[PDB]
Design an enzyme around this catalytic site. Structure first.
Site, PDB file in Angstrom:
ATOM      1  N   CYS A 162      29.381  14.784  25.512  1.00  0.00           N
ATOM      2  CA  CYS A 162      29.928  15.611  26.285  1.00  0.00           C
ATOM      3  C   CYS A 162      31.042  16.570  25.184  1.00  0.00           C
ATOM      4  O   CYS A 162      31.111  16.171  24.126  1.00  0.00           O
ATOM      5  CB  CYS A 162      31.101  15.181  27.152  1.00  0.00           C
ATOM      6  SG  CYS A 162      32.373  14.087  26.473  1.00  0.00           S
ATOM      7  N   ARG A 182      36.302  17.916  22.148  1.00  0.00           N
ATOM      8  CA  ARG A 182      35.652  17.579  20.978  1.00  0.00           C
ATOM      9  C   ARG A 182      36.138  18.970  19.708  1.00  0.00           C
ATOM     10  O   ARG A 182      36.221  18.390  18.605  1.00  0.00           O
ATOM     11  CB  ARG A 182      34.245  17.144  20.956  1.00  0.00           C
ATOM     12  CG  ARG A 182      33.253  18.691  21.065  1.00  0.00           C
ATOM     13  CD  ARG A 182      31.913  18.371  21.482  1.00  0.00           C
ATOM     14  NE  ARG A 182      31.054  19.369  21.348  1.00  0.00           N
ATOM     15  CZ  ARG A 182      29.921  19.262  21.986  1.00  0.00           C
ATOM     16  NH1 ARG A 182      29.634  18.272  22.634  1.00  0.00           N
ATOM     17  NH2 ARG A 182      29.410  20.570  22.129  1.00  0.00           N
ATOM     18  N   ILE A 224      41.104  27.480  13.872  1.00  0.00           N
ATOM     19  CA  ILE A 224      41.527  28.962  13.996  1.00  0.00           C
ATOM     20  C   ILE A 224      40.590  29.749  13.152  1.00  0.00           C
ATOM     21  O   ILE A 224      40.208  29.375  12.072  1.00  0.00           O
ATOM     22  CB  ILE A 224      42.876  29.090  13.341  1.00  0.00           C
ATOM     23  CG1 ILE A 224      44.080  28.612  14.185  1.00  0.00           C
ATOM     24  CG2 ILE A 224      43.256  30.828  13.004  1.00  0.00           C
ATOM     25  CD1 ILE A 224      45.498  28.702  13.555  1.00  0.00           C
TER      26      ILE A 224
END
Lengths: 278, 278
Positions: A162, A182, A224
């Site tokens: 998932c 994740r 980021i």
């Protein structure tokens, strides 16, 4: 102390200690593995204030997820990648049929897909309904869990892991929610997800007779994008303003009965929009 | 600052802010929803020092998991509940056949179970091997994930949620691991799990040419059984001692080739055993 501060602390930690790591495109990130923040949902709603979050998109998207839609038009019709579309046939992609993805897996996990117009009533596992039943039948349960998958991780034949695992928890008449993702894009994805799962929580709490508790956001690869560094450095200098409140405007009984007009944000006073280039 | 301190801080937070919540037995806990701790694996191994952890059991159990064993005797033969056994037939339980559980799901997820002696080579999804291949084929991957289930959550037909989700992460030639556990017993389960997944990480790092990085332990319902409060209050007063080191004693090439004699702990100077009544 204002919960948005944890989000801003995580941005700062990644700018300071993040390491260069590329993503499946090859476009770069600064990355840290493993993070967690807690946002109270009690008498406040964590829609970030250091930039304007597109609330309407957050609502309309969650509703479309809840409906189990695999019809792209049903969402855009409201006013709300390359690789996923390249897995589709011609005509299915033309008409906006996404195949067995997104909320299809929430409401019909494991069901044989036909087309986006098909009747899937009672087909596959309804993870969302199962969560709500268990809260009702046994609130102490430690398995009140719903998972979500990225569309490109098909096929389910393969037992793909998932993308997100969402766990609910009930104590003292309060519903809490923990999302494990994740990976999380801190500039764009993360603010939206916070609001999105906080809204889900408000919704489930409403129809189960509970009060919202905490939203806990946990990340694996927290990152980021390089091109978001400078706008984020500027966002870091803005003072958070008290989060707004969310109001549900009538008494609603089933998760599928909620409508966009049932909700109203109030007291939302954000700093201006920050445009961040996907 | 010594990482064990985070574990002791979590015990203290639960004693102070935890709320009464019962478990499926009805025996009580103090509970907090959502926690996270980070243990460095670089030149140290997080085997807790404020009480003696049964290292040998940690090793032998993980090896038995890795083998994919469903034979209780294969584990006890090394020198290492009510409801799970009541789901078994008579003769299967007598001979110690646990059915399709524990490491069967790590190495043969989704395979048709026959008996504990059967040949399952190439049957079902080998989650552990898939993790190791992906680390090799694409270390930047955000889906290097392996899940584990509690035995009583059968059957897989139902899409039962996992008990644990384990994510690996690679940057700068370092393998990191995050375990998400839907629930954690802080007195007994948690110390053992920390050591266990830290050992797994050491193992996978070894055969993939990487150095261990961080172990990140994330919990949903983090709890202390009422009968462990007093021994834990006493454990909280003990000063941690530098964690030991773990040494792998030969060059090992495949995950299935490791043996108990390949490992040696060194410099482990724990405070005495604390007996805690399950």
């Amino acid at each position: 102390p204002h919960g948005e501060l944890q989000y801003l602390g995580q941005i700062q930690h990644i700018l300071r200690c993040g390491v260069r790591k590329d993503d499946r495109t090859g476009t770069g990130t600064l990355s840290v593995f493993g993070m967690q923040a807690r946002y109270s949902l009690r008498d406040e709603f964590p829609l970030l204030t250091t930039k304007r979050v597109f609330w309407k998109g957050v609502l309309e998207e969650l509703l479309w997820f809840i409906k189990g839609s695999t019809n792209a038009k049903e969402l855009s019709s409201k006013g709300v990648s390359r690789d996923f579309l390249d897995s589709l046939g011609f005509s299915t992609r033309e008409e906006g049929d996404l195949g067995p993805v997104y909320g299809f897996q929430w409401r019909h996990f494991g069901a044989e897909y036909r087309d986006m117009e098909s009747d899937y009533s009672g087909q596959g596992v309804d993870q969302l309904q199962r969560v709500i039943d268990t809260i009702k039948t046994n609130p102490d349960d430690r398995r009140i869990i719903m998972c979500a998958w990225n569309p490109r991780d098909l096929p389910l034949k393969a037992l793909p892991p998932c993308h997100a695992l969402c766990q609910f928890y009930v104590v003292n008449s309060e519903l809490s929610c923990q999302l494990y993702q994740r990976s999380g894009d801190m500039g764009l994805g993360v603010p939206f997800n916070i609001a999105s799962y906080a809204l889900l929580t408000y919704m489930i709490a409403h129809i189960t007779g509970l009060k919202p508790g905490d939203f806990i956001h946990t990340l694996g690869d927290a990152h980021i994008y390089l091109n978001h560094i400078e706008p984020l450095k500027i966002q870091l200098q803005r003072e958070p303003r008290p989060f707004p409140k969310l109001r549900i405007l009538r008494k609603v009984e089933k998760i599928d009965d909620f409508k966009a007009e049932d909700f109203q944000i109030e007291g939302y006073n954000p700093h201006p929009t920050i445009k961040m280039e996907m």
